[PDB]
Amino acid sequence: LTAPPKEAARPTLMPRAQSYKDLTHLPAPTGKIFVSVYNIQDETGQFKPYPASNFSTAVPQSATAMLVTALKDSRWFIPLERQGLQNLLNERKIIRAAQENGTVAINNRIPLQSLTAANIMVEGSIIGYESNVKSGGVGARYGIGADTQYQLDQIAVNLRVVNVSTGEILSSVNTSKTILSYEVQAGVFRLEGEVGYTSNEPVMLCLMSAIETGVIFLINDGIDRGLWDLQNKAERQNDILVKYRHMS
Amino acid sequence: LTAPPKEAARPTLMPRAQSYKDLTHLPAPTGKIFVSVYNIQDETGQFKPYPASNFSTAVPQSATAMLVTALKDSRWFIPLERQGLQNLLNERKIIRAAQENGTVAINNRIPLQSLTAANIMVEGSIIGYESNVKSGGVGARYGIGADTQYQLDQIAVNLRVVNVSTGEILSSVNTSKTILSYEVQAGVFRLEGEVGYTSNEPVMLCLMSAIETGVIFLINDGIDRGLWDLQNKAERQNDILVKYRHMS
Amino acid sequence: LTAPPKEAARPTLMPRAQSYKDLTHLPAPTGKIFVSVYNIQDETGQFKPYPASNFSTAVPQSATAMLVTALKDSRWFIPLERQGLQNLLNERKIIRAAQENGTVAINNRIPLQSLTAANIMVEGSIIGYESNVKSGGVGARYGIGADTQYQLDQIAVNLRVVNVSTGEILSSVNTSKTILSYEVQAGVFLEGEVGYTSNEPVMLCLMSAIETGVIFLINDGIDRGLWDLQNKAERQNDILVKYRHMS
Amino acid sequence: LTAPPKEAARPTLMPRAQSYKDLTHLPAPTGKIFVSVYNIQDETGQFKPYPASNFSTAVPQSATAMLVTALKDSRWFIPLERQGLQNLLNERKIIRAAQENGTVAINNRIPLQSLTAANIMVEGSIIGYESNVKSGGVGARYGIGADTQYQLDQIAVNLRVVNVSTGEILSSVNTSKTILSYEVQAGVFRLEGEVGYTSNEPVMLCLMSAIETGVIFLINDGIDRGLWDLQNKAERQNDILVKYRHMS
Amino acid sequence: LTAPPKEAARPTLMPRAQSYKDLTHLPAPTGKIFVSVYNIQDETGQFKPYPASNFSTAVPQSATAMLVTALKDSRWFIPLERQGLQNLLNERKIIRAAQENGTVAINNRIPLQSLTAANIMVEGSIIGYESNVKSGGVGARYGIGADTQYQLDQIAVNLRVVNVSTGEILSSVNTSKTILSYEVQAGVFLEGEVGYTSNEPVMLCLMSAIETGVIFLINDGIDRGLWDLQNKAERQNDILVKYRHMS
Amino acid sequence: LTAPPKEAARPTLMPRAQSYKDLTHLPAPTGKIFVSVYNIQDETGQFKPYPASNFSTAVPQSATAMLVTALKDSRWFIPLERQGLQNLLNERKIIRAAQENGTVAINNRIPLQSLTAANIMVEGSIIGYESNVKSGGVGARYGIGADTQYQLDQIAVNLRVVNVSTGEILSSVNTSKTILSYEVQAGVFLEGEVGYTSNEPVMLCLMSAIETGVIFLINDGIDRGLWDLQNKAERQNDILVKYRHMS
Amino acid sequence: LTAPPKEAARPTLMPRAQSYKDLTHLPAPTGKIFVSVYNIQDETGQFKPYPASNFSTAVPQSATAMLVTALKDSRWFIPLERQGLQNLLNERKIIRAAQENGTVAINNRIPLQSLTAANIMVEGSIIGYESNVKSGGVGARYGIGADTQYQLDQIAVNLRVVNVSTGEILSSVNTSKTILSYEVQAGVFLEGEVGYTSNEPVMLCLMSAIETGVIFLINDGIDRGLWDLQNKAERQNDILVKYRHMS
Amino acid sequence: LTAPPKEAARPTLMPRAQSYKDLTHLPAPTGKIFVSVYNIQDETGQFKPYPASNFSTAVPQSATAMLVTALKDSRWFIPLERQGLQNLLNERKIIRAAQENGTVAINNRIPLQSLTAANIMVEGSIIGYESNVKSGGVGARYGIGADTQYQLDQIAVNLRVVNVSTGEILSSVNTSKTILSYEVQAGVFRLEGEVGYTSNEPVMLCLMSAIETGVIFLINDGIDRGLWDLQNKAERQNDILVKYRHMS
């Protein structure tokens, strides 16, 4: 017992909640749409307070990938790879250099085709993280005591569809989500005995949720405006679609 | 006794656990697949809090190599070397400069062949590390006392298969893993006597686990979608494959 | 007493332990293999806590050289110099500029030959240093008291053989090693106190783990038919079967 | 006494000890060897703790010059100046620009000759400085008391001979050295009276020592491997040479 | 008295001590030698501790100019200006631009010749500054008390003669010097307290050690036949045999 | 009242003391000499301790302009403007662009002349600022008490004359100066306290020391035959023999 | 009353005092002189101590604009805009691009003329800010108490006239000014306290000192025959003889 | 109440006071003058003290836009956009690229005209912000007590009219303004009870005020010097104009 500790808990796939369930069970379009995401920035401006590192950002710098993933899980869009475009072009250079002489083995040959191109691209930004937007606490001691304290933070996300052919923005949407934190404590004193518990929502998981939500609002907005069309016109009054229609 | 101390405990090869055991005992495909990994970034945005150095990242900057290693241990993929591509090209310059004159000794000669080229390349990102996502404690003193305290952190990883020939992302997956920490303490007072113990999961090792898990979900997903196929069709209902199928 | 203090303890050559002993007494191949190391990075991300300098890395930035050295001590590989390749090429410029006119003295002349070229090159990384991965302590006082406390840290290293002729990685290996620290202390209370503290060198753990990695790479290569033993009878070598067993 | 103070203690030449004595009294080769040192880096990664400046390195950045000096003192090698190569080439420009017209005075003329070129060049690194690798203390008080405390640190150095004509490393060596520190203290109490003394080894001096040692191991290794040869073959069993042979 | 304060003390020329006195009274060579100093770096790696600014170096960055000055005071070398070479070339551009048309007044005319060139150039480095290499203190109180405390630091310097015509280093030398500090203090306890503290200037120690180095370089060059003494009878000069003895 | 306060005390011209008085009353040469100063650096390496800003230098970065001013006040040298040479060349571009077409008004016309060029240029460096080189204090309390405390710092300057025509340094000089600080305090204990504290301006010491250096440079040049006095009878000038004596 | 508070005090034009009054009522020259100011730097090297931001300079970086303004207020000089020259050239590019086709409306047309060019340019530097150059305090308590404390700081400015046609500096001047601060306090002890504190604006001292410098420059130029007075009878002007007397 | 809090107070347009009122009710010229503002810098050199961020400037970096706005509100000047010139030239590139082929729809067509050019341009700087230039406090206690404290800070601004046709500065002006702060406080003790209030002037708003004032002084100065002329010469003795004339 000086070698390392062993794994506590298993790797699960990412715990997405309600937003995800809505996003997945969306009625499919007449064909999946080709989409590009280049970058969604942490335009928030915000870092963690003491005792965090000066450099610890308040929000993960991973929004871009979450958006591309949400655009895929919806089963409306095929995402074309542009976040790592440089590497993609490099592999293609190596391929073309490999097989240009027609020696490369017919089984091993990779057939190359122009890079599939998108019609609409969607970009956006993490547009604020305010911290302790609300907070409170209640405690009593009489020697026996308890108390809770809570804080909550905000996070907002812009997503927006841009038309490649024109540069007209075809849709802008602004979603928001609250991050909950709380601390429960109880202690008995005369003999001392204490129980304490604290829970923070993962900012990483709230970001993800809000991006999904945004993607839904984008699809619904595009349906209304005639960007894309449902397979079943009868499915216009889908529970999910009318729910997000109602939030507008 | 002012010269150095000698090694307490041995170098072991790196302690991988369950994810590994699943990843290795996966039923083999009809042939390997050629894969390229250029870079997986610490997109997390996060550093360690006081008293760590301001610059100590919360997560190791080593994900790329872990992925390549997991892709190899699975016995589904041959990884091609692109992380250090520049050096590879340099050694090949030196080779070609050596033997271009046909003086170099026939035993010593290195035969050069175009760089083996990948069909799918997989990239991803460490997409969040939230800290003390949960925490708690229980203690009593009566003069004799004990207490435990625990905290746990999150880490998530995106991996995604990109088709070189198109740019279509063929698969995105989002895995997550929890890092456990705890502190047990007991003391007797009258005469004082104290015992304490504290254990942290290695973030290092949780990252590695989660990347392995991701690789499995990628393979299984590819099997479903007809990217690649099994040697034994009878092995479709493999324990491992149905376990990850079930987690989707 | 403004003359300096003089050397307490002698320069020894660097105290390598078990990994080294295994690595040296390895059964030799049919010929030594030409290898290149360009760079092994401190991919760890980690610095020392207060009261260290903010900028003090947790791990030495010297892994590259340790690997080259380990590759040499094994007596399987000749390492070719690429870490300082630029200087090498510069000295070769100066040479060629010296003797191009055929005035340079025949005794002094340096004969120049194309740079010896490697077939496999091996790179890697320091993947991780986690700190106080475990820790503990036990202490009691009664006028008389004692206590020990211990902490231990982790370090891991990737090494991997890449084939120059294809880019195929021919082997990846992931080794790990634990750095031990402890503090023993006793006091009688007349007061009298004895204390002692010992830290493993992170330096020396890095070096150990890299040696271990080199062995696993050789053994792996033997299995996969990259290279072959002089004596096929020496396949069941104690060391080779020990590392075979760890796999 | 508001003008300055005058010099307490004198400039000596730099206090080298045992390593130096061994290095100097080495049996001479058949001819001195031409050597180049370009740079030996502080690959250690380490800075001083509080109360040092954040920027104070733990090790002096001066290893290069110490190695060149050690290579000279040995009376085996002529070091060719490459650390400041740029300035050398500049003075040679100024020379050539001076006397190209054949006006310059024959007494003043500087005759220029191609830059003397090395056959082997040796480079290396300061690999590691670990701090308080060991430590301890012993103290007792009875009105009268004393105590000592000690710490020691490690430092390691790679040197390696590279063959210019191939790039083959012809020798790698790894030397190490310990830096001692201690604090002695005594106090009498009833009347108080206290005496204290503290001594630190210079890290400066330990670095220098270890580099010398390395140079010896390099020469001895080269003798064995047939890089260079002794004037007197009878001097193979030299006390110093067999001492360093034994450490191998 | 809210305008400024007036001058306390006068500027003296810079208080050099023993090294200087030796360096000046050195027996002159057959002719002065032409020498170039480009740069001597603070290769020490060291800064001042709290409460100094983080950025205050432990050693002045001025060693280059000190060496040039020492090389001059010795009356063996003429130093050629290279530390500010760029400006020198600019002033020469402005000259040549002035008088190229032959209008410039003959009284005002500056005659130009391409730059005087050195044969040997000497470079070096501040190798190392260790701090509180030794320290101590003694104090007693009985109503009446006193105490002293002292610390001392080290500093070292490489200088080396390089031959322009080959790049061969013709001499390397390694000098060292200790910086003294002390604090005397007394109090009677009615309370009354007196204190005094003195630090050696690091500045001045650096300068001293560089001078010493220059001497060792000249003496070494005499031995090795770089340069020759006017009076061969002055080989056994007190100073020369003193530094010969230190070798 | 909450708009600003108005100015208390007047701008005086800059309070130079003894060095200045010596420098001005120097016997004039046969003609003034043309001189260039490009830059004199704060080669000191030193910043102010806590609570100063981390970035507050210990010495003003203004030495270059002080030296030029000193060189002018001496009435030996005409300084040519090189510190802001770039702007000078720009204004001259604007001039030439103005009047190249011969429309510009004859009253307004600026006649352009090649840039007057220097023969010797002098450069140097602030070599060193050591702090609390000495310090002390004396205090006594009996209900009634007083005390003083003093500290002093060092500052040194290299100046050197470089010959444009050759690059030979024609003179190097090394001047030094001490900065005084003190704190007087008295208190009666009813409590009542009076305090006062005075620091020499580091500014004003730097200036003084540069003037002194300029004098030593002129005197040295007189000896070495760089330049000559109008009245050879004035060789034994009080000032000149005073600085001759300090050498 | 959660929207903002309204303006307490009105914007006045900037409170300049004595220097200004002297500078304005100066007897006018035969014609105004054309001047260029490119840049006057904060060569001071100094920042504010804790609790100021580490980056707060001790002196405003604004000296250039102050100098230009002073040069204008004197009614001796027309300043030409060089501190934003790049924008000036841009607007002129836009103009020329507007009207080159001869469509632009005759009312709207901007007639372009070569950039008016200066004959002398003046540049300088904020040379030094020393802080608490002097300080003191006096306080007594008996239940009832009072105290004052004062500190004062120094600031110096170089200005110098440079001749465009030659690069000869035609005048250098070195002005200085003291910044006053004080804190008065009284308390009765029922407790009751009154306090007041007043600092001179460093801003305003800088401006005052630059004005003063401009006057010394004009007076110096009058003496040296750079420029001439309209009324030679006004040589003995009160202001001119006052500044003549300070020299 | 874990969603966000709602807006307390309405967005008003920006609360400008006396300077503004003077600036607006200025007698109009014979025609508006074309003006350019490129940049007015925070030449002040000053940051906020602890506990502000080290990087928080004392003065807003926004002076440029305030000056352009003041120049517009005066109804003497048309400001031409140069602060964002680059974007302006970019849009014009896109325009010219859009309609060069004469396909673009006649309704949609944008007619392009050379960039309107200025005759005078005015630039300046925030010259200084000194803090607590004055301060004071008065407090008295009897069980019951009160106190006030006040501080005030300074800010100055240079504006100057430069003639494009020459580079002659046609006017320089130097305005200044004081920022007021105070803290009133009262407490009763035996039972404790405390009331406090604190008011700071916005530095923002003082800057804006002072810039307006500067613009007026510039116009009045230009009227005197014959740069521009009043519509009604009878309006020379305007209340506002004679007020600012008097301040000169």
From Swiss-Prot, chains A, B, D, H:
Family: Belongs to the CsgG family.
Database matches in Gene3D superfamilies: ABC-type transport auxiliary lipoprotein component (3.40.50.10610)
Function: May be involved in the biogenesis of curli organelles.
GO biological-process terms attached to the record: curli assembly; protein secretion by the type VIII secretion system; protein transmembrane transport; single-species biofilm formation
Record-linked Pfam families: CsgG
Source species of the chain: Escherichia coli (strain K12)
Lineage: Bacteria, Pseudomonadati, Pseudomonadota, Gammaproteobacteria, Enterobacterales
Topology in membrane: Lipid-anchor
PANTHER family: CURLI PRODUCTION ASSEMBLY/TRANSPORT COMPONENT CSGG, CURLI PRODUCTION ASSEMBLY_TRANSPORT COMPONENT CSGG
InterPro entries hit by this protein: Curli_assmbl/transp-comp_CsgG (IPR005534)
The gene coding this protein: csgG
This protein's GO CC annotations: cell outer membrane; curli secretion complex; outer membrane-bounded periplasmic space; plasma membrane
Protein name per UniProt: Curli production assembly/transport component CsgG
GO molecular function: identical protein binding
Localization annotation: Cell membrane
Disulfide partners: none
Protein's UniProt keywords contain Signal: yes
Keyword terms of this UniProt record: Cell membrane, Lipoprotein, Membrane, Palmitate, Signal
Sections of the chain in a coiled coil: none
Swiss-Prot record, chains C, E, F, G:
Coiled coil: none
Record-linked InterPro entries: Curli_assmbl/transp-comp_CsgG
One record GO biological process: single-species biofilm formation
UniProt membrane topology term: Lipid-anchor
Compartments where found: Cell membrane
Molecular function GO terms recorded: identical protein binding
Highest taxon listed in the record's lineage: Bacteria
Keywords of the record: Cell membrane, Lipoprotein, Membrane, Palmitate, Signal
GO cellular component, one term: plasma membrane
Family to which this protein belongs: Belongs to the CsgG family.
PANTHER family named among the record's database cross-references: CURLI PRODUCTION ASSEMBLY/TRANSPORT COMPONENT CSGG, CURLI PRODUCTION ASSEMBLY_TRANSPORT COMPONENT CSGG
Biological role: May be involved in the biogenesis of curli organelles.
Name listed for the protein in its UniProt record: Curli production assembly/transport component CsgG
Species this protein is from: Escherichia coli (strain K12)
